[model samples]
Target: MANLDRTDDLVYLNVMELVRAVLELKNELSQLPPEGYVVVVKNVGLTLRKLIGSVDDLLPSLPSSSRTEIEGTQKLLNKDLAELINKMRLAQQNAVTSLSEEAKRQMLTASHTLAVDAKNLLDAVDQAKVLANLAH
Candidate 1:
């Protein structure tokens, strides 16, 4: 039981640490020169992979019955994250460090959700990993 508690703490801490780091990125990103917003968006994608990967490692202790929905969700979440990175690259805006208000709002709609979005995303990945590992 203690071990499980430790693992749980580890999981929560890891998630929180990741969340904080991502939050820092979100704030710092706003301050960067618009020279390459998309490039910076790539950092979010990488952070997400670590988060989902950790959850994936822990999810395997669950039973098989609930895996399907989780698997589907994870796939979409991963794709959305990847797409966001790509979208950044494609936005092709010139010198945007000091962005217009409308542009900031448009970017905010997606960038603001990084942590919450990653959490929901990992839940699905966790489900899938749990079911798959249980199969063996």
Candidate 2:
């Protein structure tokens, strides 16, 4: 029983860490100049990939009753992640010659959207944990 409780705490902590990382990445992106954008985006993209992998690994371990809700949020996360990647690519191409303010705004918006989705996933996981405890 103690072991199970510890595992649950660890999972929640891991999710919180990931969400915080995403939020920090967004802040970092916000402060960077256009010339610095591509490098930041590339590095953060790798981080986001790792986050996706971690969530994928975690999904199977989640309670069965909450799995579907978490899975749905994961799908949305994937969709937003893809959109962010595309925006990053466009930003990279634009940076080579010239990056417009509008282009930067679009990329930032995408990043913000991705961050929101990440938070939503965290909330879903938190809710799942609550439901699991109630079931017990």
Candidate 3:
């Protein structure tokens, strides 16, 4: 059968890109030294902002029945995003004395968790799209 027309194609693509960007940020942070964390963390924040915006754009297109699940996933992503930003700021301020290992560890963990949340959001959107198609 022919593939159903997809109205959320662009928004889905955008979310995928942002999710990959977050994963890349995690990888970059793992390789870089503590002194370099600031720049990479800043980039991660920017990517997350765009990701959330894209998700918001995407929500309107999903089936109403799927909205609750998607919104819940989005909320989880937002919570992780806030935690990551808080950890990043703490790490930045404490880096004055040759960044503590504990601070570095926390930041790494935060980024990793953020990446997972982004992935979850991407998957939620994909599932929602499938459900939408099935309903048509």
Candidate 4:
């Protein structure tokens, strides 16, 4: 929900937004509504964009030691998140009849996978922040 333009804030805010988005998707799947598929899919795109943008800004500025771990986390998230967005985008293209059984299954899996990824990333960020503090 935050703008996420400030570099110092992205890691924390990124994880926050990702968690919220995952919850939104989780709620959608649990209800399995036929009426509001587009909105749920849009939320997926929103979270992914937040993630992609914030992570892009955050990665290059990290200490090399922390950067290595975060970058590895970023790599995994990038692939999984992108695939999730792609699947959701295709579903959104025709909201009238979106998400075949397979797509629905994939979207659910993606949301769950990315929730775990967000937590992992947050842990890495927490460690980095502590180390950065100690070094300072």
Candidate 5:
């Protein structure tokens, strides 16, 4: 029973650490200069890979319910990140950032959810982590 308790603690710790990492990237994304946002997003993609890889190592021990939810969110986050990076590259080539309404209006419909999707995953993870931490 004690060992089971420890395993549960380990799972939460791993999840919280990953949540923190994603939050850090979100902070960087918000503060980075528009001209270099693509570069940062690429770095963010790398970190996201690292996060999922590490989180995978602990997934077998995570509750099955949370495991499925995390997997779903991770998949969505990956897809959105790809679109985010591609559009950012196009914008950079055209000497613009998506923040400009005219430039954003010109982007593909598929890209409309990129930023918001990533933000939603970050928010979901952060909220869970915060709630767990408060319970500690």
Candidate 6:
């Protein structure tokens, strides 16, 4: 597992790490066994949820770069994405509770893909915005 510095904003496990963690979890509570894995998954999901707020803060601060239409579109899009991320985080909570190892494996792949895509999308948006500046 990646060591998340608690002082820095907490970052949840990426999709790939989630899968790895679950597989390694294998029902050992002391060390992210099944139940512990559940806790970890929630932590990660919560981190992603926190990131939505960061994304919200950033999108609006963009400078004189893209047209207003583009900015407006992106604002709405980011809001929607945040909603979706929240929805997924909720789903992941349920999944960690009820999903079996095999089911979690599939989720791991799907969610990791989504997480990576989202990270990339956010990166692209930041870079393209002429005035975009993010510390994270």
lDDT of 5 at 131: 46
**Every candidate's lDDT:** 0.57, 0.67, 0.72, 0.71, 0.53, 0.45
> How do the residues 38-115 of candidate 1 rate in per-residue lDDT, one tens digit apiece?
555666666666766765665566565555665555576577666555445544452444545445444544555556
User: What's model 5's overall lDDT?
Assistant: 0.53
Question: At residue 8, what lDDT does model 2 achieve?
Answer: 50
Please, what are the lDDT tens digits per residue for candidate 4 over residues 1-136?
3232346676677777877887888766646554466577667667767876776676665677898888788788778777777767655554556446566677778878887887788778667766776685
Query: lDDT by residue for model 3 over 27-115, one digit each (tens)?
Result: 66656654676677677777777777877777887778778887898788778878877887777677656665667678778877877
Best by lDDT: 3
lDDT-sorted candidate list, best first:
3, 4, 2, 1, 5, 6
Q: How well does candidate 3 score on lDDT at residue 124? A: 78
Superposed model 3: Cα runs more than 4 Å off: 1-8, 27-36, 96-99
Measured on C-alpha atoms, candidate 4 has an lDDT of 0.71
Residue 39, model 1: Cα distance from true site in angstroms: 5.1
**Ranking of all candidate structures by their TM-score, best first:** 3, 2, 4, 1, 5, 6
lDDT of 6 by residue, 104-131 (tens): 4544554454455545545444454533
lDDT tens digits, residues 1-136, model 2? 2223546554455545555655665667656665676675665566666666766776676688788887788788678767767877676677646565556667778767776777687778767766667785
**Candidate 4 residue pairs that clash:** none
Angstrom error of the Cα, residue 109, model 6: value is: 0.9
- TM-score of predicted structure 1: 0.61
Query: Which pairs of residues collide in model 6?
Result: 15-112, 27-34, 28-33
Give the C-alpha miss distance for residue 76 in model 6, angstroms.
12
Q: How many residue pairs clash in all the candidates, one count each?
A: 3, 0, 0, 0, 0, 3
lDDT, candidate 3, residue 134? 75
